[PDB]
Design a binder for this molecule. Structure first.
Ligand code: MG
Ligand code: MG
Ligand code: MG
Ligand code: MG
Ligand code: MG
Ligand code: MG
Ligand code: MG
Ligand code: MG
Ligand code: MG
Ligand code: MG
Ligand code: MG
Ligand code: MG
Ligand code: MG
Ligand code: MG
Ligand code: MG
Ligand code: MG
Ligand code: MG
Ligand code: MG
Ligand code: MG
Ligand code: MG
Ligand code: MG
Ligand code: MG
Ligand code: MG
Ligand code: MG
Ligand code: MG
Ligand code: MG
Ligand code: MG
Ligand code: MG
Ligand code: MG
Ligand code: MG
Ligand code: MG
Ligand code: MG
Ligand code: MG
Ligand code: MG
Ligand code: MG
Ligand code: MG
Ligand code: MG
Ligand code: MG
Ligand code: MG
Ligand code: MG
Ligand code: MG
Ligand code: MG
Ligand code: MG
Ligand code: MG
Ligand code: MG
Ligand code: MG
Ligand code: MG
Ligand code: MG
Ligand code: MG
Ligand code: MG
Ligand code: MG
Ligand code: MG
Ligand code: MG
Ligand code: MG
Ligand code: MG
Ligand code: MG
Ligand code: MG
Ligand code: MG
Ligand code: MG
Ligand code: MG
Ligand code: MG
Ligand code: MG
Ligand code: MG
Ligand code: MG
Ligand code: MG
Ligand code: MG
Ligand code: MG
Ligand code: MG
Ligand code: MG
Ligand code: MG
Ligand code: MG
Ligand code: MG
Ligand code: MG
Ligand code: MG
Ligand code: MG
Ligand code: MG
Ligand code: MG
Ligand code: MG
Ligand code: MG
Ligand code: MG
Ligand code: MG
Ligand code: MG
Ligand code: MG
Ligand code: MG
Ligand code: MG
Ligand code: MG
Ligand code: MG
Ligand code: MG
Ligand code: MG
Ligand code: MG
Ligand code: MG
Ligand code: MG
Ligand code: MG
Ligand code: MG
Ligand code: MG
Ligand code: MG
Ligand code: MG
Ligand code: MG
Ligand code: MG
Ligand code: MG
Ligand code: MG
Ligand code: ZN
Lengths: 252, 63, 91, 50, 112, 77
RNA sequence: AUGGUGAACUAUGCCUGAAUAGGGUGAAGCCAGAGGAAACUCUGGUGGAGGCUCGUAGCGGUUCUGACGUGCAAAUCGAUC
RNA sequence: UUCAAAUGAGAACUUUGAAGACUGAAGUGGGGAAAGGUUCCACGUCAACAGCAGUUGGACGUGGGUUAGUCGAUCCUAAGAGAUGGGGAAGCUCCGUUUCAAAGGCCUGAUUUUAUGCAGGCCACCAUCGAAAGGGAAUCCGGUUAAGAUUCCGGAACCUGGAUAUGGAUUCUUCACGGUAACGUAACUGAAUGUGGAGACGUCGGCGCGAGCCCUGGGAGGAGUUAUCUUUUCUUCUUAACAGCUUAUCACCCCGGAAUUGGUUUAUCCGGAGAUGGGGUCUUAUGGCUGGAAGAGGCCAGCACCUUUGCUGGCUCCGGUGCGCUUGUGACGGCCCGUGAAAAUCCACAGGAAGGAAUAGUUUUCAUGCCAGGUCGUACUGAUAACCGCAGCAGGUCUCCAAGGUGAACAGCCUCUAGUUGAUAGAAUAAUGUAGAUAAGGGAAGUCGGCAAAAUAGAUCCGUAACUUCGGGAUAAGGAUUGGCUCUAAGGGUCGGGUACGAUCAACUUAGAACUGGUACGGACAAGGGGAAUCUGACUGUCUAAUUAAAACAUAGCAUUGCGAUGGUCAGAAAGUGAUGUUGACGCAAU
């Protein structure tokens, strides 16, 4: 039969990200000479909504060390940072909400955000609204630092990898019921074309592994193997358990 | 001729009415009219001394 | 004259969606539309303007905050944590 | 189409000229065999397709 | 009763196709097309419409004398006076306080 | 387009290198509330715009017309 | 089977434009007032909320299993919706 | 639809006159976008074509007709398209678009062999196509044609480029003064570089103001009606872009220093971070008066004469009103897990390289002056006949302007302006039909089934159950009232009052009381049937264009799965390829 929906997604025709209104990509400062020997100061000049994103952006501007001009950056605003605030960035920066520092220079327990996966990658970890990473240890020989990501995962990255002190703004966005179809409508209208969702169990066999039959039903385990092939992977991929989760979760 | 007789109150009974009382003349229009009149009577009384600013100020919020 | 025994702002949804959802919405609505205190100048004039953004009418500071409330519990504890942790570093 | 390209107007003009009956003097030529213009077009019977 | 027609080919009601009805000396109603409204220039520091300064559409400023584009203070047509009080005050004290910091830590480097 | 009201400035106009042609119009008009009177507009046509001076006094009117440059090609009415 | 041509219909996304009588309802916020030992409770206004409602244009196409059914028409017409 | 005339061999059907109607400003009116392509217009004219006709035509024949510095295109950028160094591919070619690239051009100085070599310092921005609705330099009125006109003619402007002289301003304190200040101005030097603004932005609600329209008094005119009545009915009384002065909610400055808290919006917001008060500053939307400009246009009267067609007179004035209508705009307010383009282009500021006077310099962001503005489109239709449906097809096809009454109303019904009066025709009125109505008594007995039809309906007042997520259910149900005329009562504005009232002008709203009629009155139009339950989907929403609109799909809500980027899911023949990704677990993907 036909190419199913989740395969058509990849050719990104009607499926590319709706991008027109976006502020620009959020990114730490390029890791230059200032930030890795000293600190450099900026002013947050505006904190601002970014369509499709949930957390507001901070627009923060710095002087240029090598040329007379301003260079502006787009940060993701940590909660509590504000317009006119001075933002300090560098190895020898001080430990306050809003500043950006290398995880090597912060005590364990430090609560950071937008952290780099490798030094210089201008930020990758915990950027969504409300999210953060905790520093839970250091290993000064072979300078690594060990952190706990929002997913629960613990991971060890370079101590020069940078992050910004505090948590990302907009927390609890998801506490509030969407209430109606229409609010989801406008939600995804500014993201990508993933809404609404026909159940494969409502299609015909041409369309889906789940399609067809004189009652609606999956007709075979919907836990599909990792090694399955395109066209096959619909449902609980690689599922190592299944069913209502009883009892406390949380990584021991 | 007809307009005249309306100026004279004719042709305005219940049998001649098809919009709601409110569609005919809004409650809110009535209110604003009224409230502007109280409001600017206070202003002139104050500005004459006929009333004292203290009494005015209570009258305002009462109005 | 009390207009509603309990739906409050949530009366705009009529009978739809189910009382429970309307409850949850009620709580965060009241939060987000509320007027808050401004730390910098002291007048209670901080109103929201899109999730996470909190600006002051007078004086004009804008502070990144919670999706529906100026300060988030998590934010707040984190703040004092940082207070605490930094304290060690000069001491 | 009320606000046209030269290219289209140019074609239009070439079409205006081609719209005439056979020049009768041709009928009288030795061995002449053309009775009538067999390629006459009319705006309300056959469209130009530009 | 006298009705009216657009005067350019554009039939649609777009921002660039605003119309105003007018009585001519012929004693008839006629459409006139209307350019979009100019907005007031704004202050670099605060953002308020800055007083003193004419408001035209941008190219219309190169048609108009220099004095429609300034007030006669420092940062004239650019920042909004109060914003420049602030600038002067802030400059001064900080340049002053800089003298202060130097001589204080000069004493720290001589007494310790 | 323009209007002029300094009698002195006007004579200065009427002799400018481009000012070739000019005209005098006469208007019957009423005075205050009562009677009427004789208004006269002096229009010099300079190159880029048309200056026009309204002398409201029939007296000043006559004498002004004599001062009119004897090469100016005045259109009377 | 091989190689080509179509998104002028239509499905969906994107960019840029445009359009939508008149009514009914009366949500937050706000003013004044009344009771009560207290906690607190009531009344009148104001305001103008909603994938709210009556209903045109719009968009749709429910019933007559109406018209037509060698048609006005290879899907239309009328009433009702 | 009708009478008559004219024309013609011929007239139900052409032209003109008369009459009767219609569309009824949500148009059968006045223009446009796509599309057509001469259909426009004149003259001639009927073989075919316009399912009767034809003297008529969107037909046939022959001609005429589309005028721009300012209206568009052209320029800019949007989704996106797409060259180039390159990398894949046997290859047609695929990828990538600033990429693993030695990616280029400006300002003036150096020349006084001379024409443009090198001397500085920059600037590293690295194609290009992509909007006749987005952005955007500048034009208006009157007249004129068989058919063009914001395009010609008349008159009056404005922009852009280029030239430049004269005046003014500035300077011996060189690069202006004034004002405490907001800031004023006719000017008032300013390279590199930097920075700021404008361009530039959602939606709804009430309120305020402008414009045009609507209603209306006086007056000066023309028309209509006049047995009777009407100081009456209809109509004309207009003012462009542009320019001078003036004009504003907002905002801001100076004085001052606030509890007895004041000020204040319809809407509760503001003040020791300086209110209220007084006095000033600013934007010029918009309006006023004047210039343009009465010479125009509009309406009349009085003579002239086959003619081109004139000639001469007058008058074109002063006001009122508002929850009116449409549109514009402002100050605000609601809303969002939605916060509602970009670029060209224009200005400003910070900076201070440089250049510049007293025996005479500086100045074209002040005034006035001179020259030039190419190229293509411009006719007409835009639809019950100019487009698409084989056609002059009851279908389909984006849009602006919008008068009076009734009435809540852009509804229906009647009307003014404009436009139509086209659709084969005549004679009869059998059956059976289609479409529109009515029926005594009974009242669903008809039928699978109340299918069809009938009943109900507006507004004011009264009255309103179960149950409920407390929001509803609800116009629940159920009732009364409603015309005409004639009265009373309540609801407002503007003014002067030493430091209690008076006088005046202008609006339907609501309630009550008489009188009155064949008991009628939402009098046509317009306008909900209601109730009790079972099954079923929560709801609003969605689909089988053309036999299924549903209980099917969606949805919010609930729950499960995968994944920390050297990744999950997915694309590709391959790749220095691609979607999610301007992304990062409050995330993306999969059920
Ligand atoms: Mg993309
Ligand atoms: Mg979709
Ligand atoms: Mg689904
Ligand atoms: Mg699903
Ligand atoms: Mg199915
Ligand atoms: Mg299958
Ligand atoms: Mg399977
Ligand atoms: Mg199945
Ligand atoms: Mg199932
Ligand atoms: Mg009300
Ligand atoms: Mg009002
Ligand atoms: Mg008043
Ligand atoms: Mg008060
Ligand atoms: Mg056709
Ligand atoms: Mg064809
Ligand atoms: Mg036109
Ligand atoms: Mg000015
Ligand atoms: Mg100025
Ligand atoms: Mg200076
Ligand atoms: Mg299409
Ligand atoms: Mg709009
Ligand atoms: Mg409406
Ligand atoms: Mg109603
Ligand atoms: Mg409505
Ligand atoms: Mg008490
Ligand atoms: Mg409403
Ligand atoms: Mg609805
Ligand atoms: Mg409804
Ligand atoms: Mg209705
Ligand atoms: Mg309908
Ligand atoms: Mg319809
Ligand atoms: Mg629909
Ligand atoms: Mg039908
Ligand atoms: Mg049928
Ligand atoms: Mg039949
Ligand atoms: Mg006939
Ligand atoms: Mg009639
Ligand atoms: Mg009619
Ligand atoms: Mg109508
Ligand atoms: Mg017709
Ligand atoms: Mg036309
Ligand atoms: Mg055509
Ligand atoms: Mg014709
Ligand atoms: Mg014939
Ligand atoms: Mg034909
Ligand atoms: Mg025929
Ligand atoms: Mg015939
Ligand atoms: Mg011909
Ligand atoms: Mg011809
Ligand atoms: Mg133009
Ligand atoms: Mg060009
Ligand atoms: Mg390519
Ligand atoms: Mg282009
Ligand atoms: Mg364009
Ligand atoms: Mg355009
Ligand atoms: Mg004309
Ligand atoms: Mg001509
Ligand atoms: Mg024409
Ligand atoms: Mg001309
Ligand atoms: Mg001229
Ligand atoms: Mg010039
Ligand atoms: Mg001066
Ligand atoms: Mg700029
Ligand atoms: Mg900007
Ligand atoms: Mg735009
Ligand atoms: Mg203009
Ligand atoms: Mg004042
Ligand atoms: Mg003063
Ligand atoms: Mg409209
Ligand atoms: Mg906004
Ligand atoms: Mg400017
Ligand atoms: Mg030098
Ligand atoms: Mg100049
Ligand atoms: Mg035309
Ligand atoms: Mg036609
Ligand atoms: Mg048709
Ligand atoms: Mg017509
Ligand atoms: Mg027929
Ligand atoms: Mg017959
Ligand atoms: Mg019967
Ligand atoms: Mg009965
Ligand atoms: Mg039975
Ligand atoms: Mg029975
Ligand atoms: Mg039976
Ligand atoms: Mg049955
Ligand atoms: Mg049965
Ligand atoms: Mg029925
Ligand atoms: Mg009956
Ligand atoms: Mg019920
Ligand atoms: Mg009565
Ligand atoms: Mg009275
Ligand atoms: Mg009175
Ligand atoms: Mg059953
Ligand atoms: Mg349903
Ligand atoms: Mg539904
Ligand atoms: Mg079907
Ligand atoms: Mg089929
Ligand atoms: Mg349905
Ligand atoms: Mg159907
Ligand atoms: Mg459930
Ligand atoms: Mg390779
Ligand atoms: Zn504040």
């Amino acid at each position: 039969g036909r190419v199913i929906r989740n395969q058509r997604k990849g050719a990104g025709s009607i499926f590319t990200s709706h991008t027109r209104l976006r502020q620009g990509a959020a990114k730490l400062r390029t890791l230059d000479y200032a930030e890795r020997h000293g600190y450099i100061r900026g002013i947050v000049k505006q904190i601002v909504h970014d369509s499709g994103r949930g957390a507001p952006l901070a627009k923060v501007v710095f002087r240029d060390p090598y040329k007379y001009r301003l260079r502006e950056e787009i940060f993701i605003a940590n909660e509590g940072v504000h317009t006119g605030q001075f933002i300090y960035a560098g190895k020898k920066a001080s430990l306050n909400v809003g500043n950006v520092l290398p995880l090597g220079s912060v005590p364990e327990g430090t609560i950071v955000s937008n952290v780099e996966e490798k030094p210089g990658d201008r930020g990758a970890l915990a950027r969504a609204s409300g999210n953060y990473v905790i520093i839970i240890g250091h290993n000064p020989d072979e300078n690594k630092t060990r952190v706990r990501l929002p997913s629960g995962a613990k991971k060890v990255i370079s101590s020069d990898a940078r992050g910004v002190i505090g948590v990302i703004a907009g927390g609890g966005r998801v506490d509030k019921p969407l209430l109606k179809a229409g609010r989801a409508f406008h939600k995804y209208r500014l993201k990508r074309n993933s809404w609404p969702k026909t159940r494969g169990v409502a299609m015909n066999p041409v369309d889906h592994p789940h399609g067809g039959g004189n009652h609606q039903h999956i007709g075979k385990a919907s836990t599909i193997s990792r090694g399955a092939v395109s066209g096959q992977k619909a449902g609980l991929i690689a599922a190592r358990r299944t069913g209502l989760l009883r009892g406390s979760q949380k990584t021991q | 001729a007809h307009a005249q007789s309306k100026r004279e109150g004719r042709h305005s009974g219940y049998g001649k009415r098809k919009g709601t009382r409110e569609a005919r003349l809004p409650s809110q229009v009535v209110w604003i009219r009224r409230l502007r009149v109280l409001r600017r009577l206070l202003a002139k009384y104050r500005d004459a001394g006929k009333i004292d600013k203290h009494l005015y100020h209570v009258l305002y919020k009462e109005s | 004259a009390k207009r509603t025994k309990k739906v409050g702002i949530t009366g705009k949804y009529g009978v739809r969606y189910g009382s429970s959802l309307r409850r949850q919405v009620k709580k965060l609505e009241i939060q987000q539309h509320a007027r808050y205190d401004c730390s910098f100048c002291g007048k209670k004039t901080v109103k929201r303007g899109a999730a996470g953004i909190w600006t002051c009418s007078c004086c004009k500071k804008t502070v990144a905050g919670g999706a529906y409330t100026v300060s988030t519990a998590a934010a707040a504890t984190v703040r004092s944590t940082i207070r605490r942790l930094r304290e060690m570093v000069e001491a | 189409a009320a606000q046209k390209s030269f290219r289209i107007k140019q074609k239009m003009a070439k079409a205006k000229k081609q719209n005439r009956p056979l020049p009768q003097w041709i009928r009288l030529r030795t061995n002449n065999t053309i009775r009538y213009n067999a390629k006459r077009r009319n705006w309300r019977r056959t469209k130009m397709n530009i | 009763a006298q009705r009216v027609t657009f005067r350019r080919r554009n039939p649609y009601n777009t921002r660039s196709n605003k119309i105003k009805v007018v009585k001519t000396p012929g004693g008839i109603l006629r459409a006139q097309h209307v350019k979009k409204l100019a907005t007031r220039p704004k202050c670099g520091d605060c953002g308020s419409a800055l007083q003193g300064i004419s408001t035209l559409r941008p190219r219309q400023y190169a048609t108009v004398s220099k004095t429609h584009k300034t007030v006669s203070r420092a940062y004239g047509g650019s920042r909004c006076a109060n914003c420049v009080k602030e600038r002067i005050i802030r400059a001064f004290l900080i340049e002053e306080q800089k003298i202060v910091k130097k001589v204080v830590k000069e004493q720290t480097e001589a007494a310790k | 387009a323009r209007e002029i009201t300094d009698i002195k400035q006007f004579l200065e106009l009427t002799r400018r290198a481009d000012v070739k042609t000019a005209t005098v119009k006469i208007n019957k008009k009423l005075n205050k509330a009562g009677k009427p009177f004789r208004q006269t507009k002096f229009k010099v046509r300079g190159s880029s715009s048309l200056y026009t001076l309204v002398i409201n006094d029939a007296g000043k009117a006559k004498k002004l017309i004599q001062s009119l440059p004897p090469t100016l090609k005045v259109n009377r009415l």
